[PDB]
Design an enzyme around this catalytic site. Structure first.
Site, PDB file in Angstrom:
ATOM      1  CG  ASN A 110      27.812  16.936  53.433  1.00 18.26           C
ATOM      2  OD1 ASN A 110      26.623  17.271  53.208  1.00 18.26           O
ATOM      3  ND2 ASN A 110      28.093  15.654  53.459  1.00 18.26           N
ATOM      4  CG  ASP A 134      24.812  17.489  55.636  1.00 15.59           C
ATOM      5  OD1 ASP A 134      24.272  16.986  56.706  1.00 15.59           O
ATOM      6  OD2 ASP A 134      24.346  17.616  54.500  1.00 15.59           O
TER       7      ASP A 134
HETATM    8  C1  LIG Z   1      19.283  34.374  43.040  1.00 19.27           C
HETATM    9  N1  LIG Z   1      19.843  33.599  43.679  1.00 19.27           N
HETATM   10  C2  LIG Z   1      19.852  32.451  42.856  1.00 19.27           C
HETATM   11  C3  LIG Z   1      21.210  31.879  42.800  1.00 19.27           C
HETATM   12  N2  LIG Z   1      21.591  31.535  43.906  1.00 19.27           N
HETATM   13  C4  LIG Z   1      22.917  30.800  43.839  1.00 19.27           C
HETATM   14  C5  LIG Z   1      23.222  30.284  45.361  1.00 19.27           C
HETATM   15  C6  LIG Z   1      22.246  29.241  45.896  1.00 19.27           C
HETATM   16  C7  LIG Z   1      22.334  28.896  47.092  1.00 19.27           C
HETATM   17  C8  LIG Z   1      23.725  29.008  47.938  1.00 19.27           C
HETATM   18  C9  LIG Z   1      23.811  28.495  49.311  1.00 19.27           C
HETATM   19  C10 LIG Z   1      24.064  29.613  50.276  1.00 19.27           C
HETATM   20  N3  LIG Z   1      24.302  29.029  51.498  1.00 19.27           N
HETATM   21  C11 LIG Z   1      24.401  27.567  51.862  1.00 19.27           C
HETATM   22  N4  LIG Z   1      24.437  27.477  53.135  1.00 19.27           N
HETATM   23  C12 LIG Z   1      24.218  26.011  53.489  1.00 19.27           C
HETATM   24  C13 LIG Z   1      25.071  25.413  54.635  1.00 19.27           C
HETATM   25  C14 LIG Z   1      24.890  24.187  55.303  1.00 19.27           C
HETATM   26  C15 LIG Z   1      23.941  23.411  54.674  1.00 19.27           C
HETATM   27  C16 LIG Z   1      23.522  22.172  55.358  1.00 19.27           C
HETATM   28  C17 LIG Z   1      23.337  22.282  56.590  1.00 19.27           C
HETATM   29  C18 LIG Z   1      23.073  20.944  57.770  1.00 19.27           C
HETATM   30  C19 LIG Z   1      23.857  21.604  58.938  1.00 19.27           C
HETATM   31  C20 LIG Z   1      23.892  20.918  60.056  1.00 19.27           C
HETATM   32  C21 LIG Z   1      24.603  21.599  61.107  1.00 19.27           C
HETATM   33  O1  LIG Z   1      24.128  22.650  61.740  1.00 19.27           O
HETATM   34  C22 LIG Z   1      25.012  23.173  62.520  1.00 19.27           C
HETATM   35  C23 LIG Z   1      26.039  22.124  62.566  1.00 19.27           C
HETATM   36  O2  LIG Z   1      25.759  21.488  61.770  1.00 19.27           O
HETATM   37  C24 LIG Z   1      23.097  19.616  60.096  1.00 19.27           C
HETATM   38  C25 LIG Z   1      22.466  19.178  58.814  1.00 19.27           C
HETATM   39  N5  LIG Z   1      22.644  20.202  57.715  1.00 19.27           N
HETATM   40  C26 LIG Z   1      22.936  23.709  53.649  1.00 19.27           C
HETATM   41  C27 LIG Z   1      23.151  25.189  53.348  1.00 19.27           C
HETATM   42  N6  LIG Z   1      23.982  26.697  50.632  1.00 19.27           N
HETATM   43  C28 LIG Z   1      23.789  27.336  49.563  1.00 19.27           C
HETATM   44  N7  LIG Z   1      23.701  26.075  48.608  1.00 19.27           N
HETATM   45  C29 LIG Z   1      24.293  24.799  48.534  1.00 19.27           C
HETATM   46  C30 LIG Z   1      22.933  23.848  49.495  1.00 19.27           C
HETATM   47  C31 LIG Z   1      23.178  22.310  49.157  1.00 19.27           C
HETATM   48  C32 LIG Z   1      23.814  21.931  47.970  1.00 19.27           C
HETATM   49  O3  LIG Z   1      22.710  21.818  46.984  1.00 19.27           O
HETATM   50  C33 LIG Z   1      25.011  22.807  47.250  1.00 19.27           C
HETATM   51  C34 LIG Z   1      24.665  24.356  47.302  1.00 19.27           C
HETATM   52  C35 LIG Z   1      24.501  29.762  47.217  1.00 19.27           C
HETATM   53  C36 LIG Z   1      24.464  30.424  45.934  1.00 19.27           C
HETATM   54  C37 LIG Z   1      21.644  32.454  44.842  1.00 19.27           C
HETATM   55  C38 LIG Z   1      21.000  33.934  44.462  1.00 19.27           C
END
Ligand SMILES: CN1CCN(Cc2ccc(-c3cnc(Nc4ccc(C#Cc5cc(C6OCCO6)ccn5)cc4)nc3N[C@H]3CC[C@@H](O)CC3)cc2)CC1
Ligand SMILES: CN1CCN(Cc2ccc(-c3cnc(Nc4ccc(C#Cc5cc(C6OCCO6)ccn5)cc4)nc3N[C@H]3CC[C@@H](O)CC3)cc2)CC1
Ligand SMILES: [Cl-]
Ligand SMILES: [Cl-]
Ligand SMILES: [Cl-]
Ligand SMILES: [Cl-]
Ligand SMILES: [Cl-]
Ligand SMILES: [Mg+2]
Lengths: 236, 250
Positions: free
Chosen positions: B132, B145
């Site tokens: 998280n 999260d």
């Molecule tokens: C071509 N293509 C394919 C390859 N990719 C590689 C890649 C993919 C995604 C990301 C990424 C990017 N951003 C994020 N951001 C993120 C931040 C937080 C969460 C959570 C949330 C949440 C937030 C709250 C909250 O809101 C305000 C305050 O608190 C409440 C409940 N849940 C999910 C994603 N993740 C990301 N991934 C996490 C998602 C969760 C877990 O599986 C680990 C990885 C990175 C690299 C990318 C390119």
């Protein structure tokens, strides 16, 4: 049928863990010699004939199956403890390779007898009192690509390669960042387990040969067993 | 005045799936901003009132909520992903170079700084863990999260009494420091989830990692003290971690 033991020669104790269709428990086996033996308790006659120090030997059946006691437990959990203080000292490369040679020696035995170990993994390997590993329990991230589609001794070679990775990483879970459902497409596109940090290229070339797409292109356990024994030889 | 946090649906373009949330999936997307420029974002799936209490947050070590769509949570995009997966990769030669201790501590300090900011507002992060924690483009960690709604991260008192205070977050953070010090190990190797309460109740805790400094382990050990009133706050932790970090060479 010949090796079925009288139930009243077995004292059961605490639970040691869980099994496929039941629990695993400690026990005292009263032998024909008069002394009691510390054992573990959970067809099988085909394994009473098995005799190999790196293969785990059946003692009898009562249904309960009477197996030896490996005071150091499974190899997977033993690898993680080593990375903690108080636990076993940091395992050097030589000792790590010996874990791989013992397993290869055991699979070299079963493969020569046309026996397939369909769940070969670091968790299914046990550590004898002398720190010698021996295979047992004979899970998508260990299944070969061809077996996901539909299993031969070449599929155990694949699982063996994954076990070499579990050992090289000292207990990491295979394919970090990949979900179980993504495995087939991940493998079907040609990707494999990445090389551990401080792992010799000579060692990664061996485990990598275990995941060649065509099963026929992978080495046999006897070939692997020597590639590892010789690499271990070349180390001080 | 709760209109400020709702974003028009037609300003959001959804793309691939990135993973799974506990209650919903996660996807990429483009957020068309008032600036006229598009922003890369992630989209997770009474609820609308807590998002407003959070959109006023402003801290580098805390993830910022960009808005909500109709329900979906719009959040920044972190091309480096979560900290937990980044630790496992670091141990693969293909992934990030071996992370030294100093960098590992900067991760802890960042997480502690963000949690200090949340405790100063009586906000509870009822599931803190390496998975998280997100890595910014500059490698600074920011907690995520938290809000809006894992046995080996829940505090002993929270397992039984179903309670949760800021001291229970300190517990999860202590376990989080352990994940960082171990570079991705699962807590309590050799213990099942159904054994955790009895394991902790008899007085057992996470074992000190191999190369972990005694001083770093004493900090994380204080997080798991049986009495919540004996555990340090996040402001005390942050400074103990900042000072240890300064005591190491550059
Ligand atoms: C071509 N293509 C394919 C390859 N990719 C590689 C890649 C993919 C995604 C990301 C990424 C990017 N951003 C994020 N951001 C993120 C931040 C937080 C969460 C959570 C949330 C949440 C937030 C709250 C909250 O809101 C305000 C305050 O608190 C409440 C409940 N849940 C999910 C994603 N993740 C990301 N991934 C996490 C998602 C969760 C877990 O599986 C680990 C990885 C990175 C690299 C990318 C390119
Ligand atoms: C470092 N530290 C040291 C102290 N440790 C405590 C501990 C506790 C129990 C044992 C142990 C002792 N003995 C056994 N025996 C055993 C071996 C294999 C199986 C399986 C399967 C199987 C086994 C045989 C066989 O028959 C005779 C010989 O082998 C044939 C076909 N399939 C089950 C039990 N397990 C043992 N453990 C099993 C128990 C659960 C199982 O799922 C994994 C490992 C060890 C250690 C914790 C770690
Ligand atoms: Cl009995
Ligand atoms: Cl990998
Ligand atoms: Cl869309
Ligand atoms: Cl942010
Ligand atoms: Cl532990
Ligand atoms: Mg098993």
């Amino acid at each position: 049928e010949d090796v079925v033991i009288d139930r009243n020669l077995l004292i059961l104790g605490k639970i040691l863990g869980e099994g496929e269709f039941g629990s695993v428990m400690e026990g005292n086996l009263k032998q024909e010699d008069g002394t009691s033996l510390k054992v573990a308790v959970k067809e099988a006659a085909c394994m009473k004939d098995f005799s190999h120090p790196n293969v785990i030997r059946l003692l009898g059946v009562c249904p309960m199956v009477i197996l030896p006691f490996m005071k150091y437990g499974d190899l997977h959990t033993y690898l993680l403890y080593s990375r903690l203080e108080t636990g076993p000292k940091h395992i050097p490369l030589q000792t790590l390779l010996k874990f791989m040679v013992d397993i290869a020696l055991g699979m070299e035995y079963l493969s020569n007898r046309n026996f397939l170990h369909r769940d070969l993994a670091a968790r299914n390997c046990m550590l004898r009192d002398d720190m010698t590993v021996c295979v047992a329990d004979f899970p998508v991230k260990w299944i070969a690509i061809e077996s996901l589609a539909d299993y031969t001794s070449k599929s155990d070679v694949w699982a063996f390669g994954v076990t070499m990775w579990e050992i090289a990483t000292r207990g990491m879970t295979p394919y970090p960042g990949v979900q179980n459902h993504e495995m087939y497409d991940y493998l079907l596109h040609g990707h494999r387990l990445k090389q551990p940090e401080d792992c010799l290229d000579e060692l990664y070339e061996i485990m990598y040969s275990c995941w060649r797409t065509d099963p026929l292109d992978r080495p046999t356990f006897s070939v692997l067993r020597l590639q590892l024994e010789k690499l271990l030889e070349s180390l001080p």
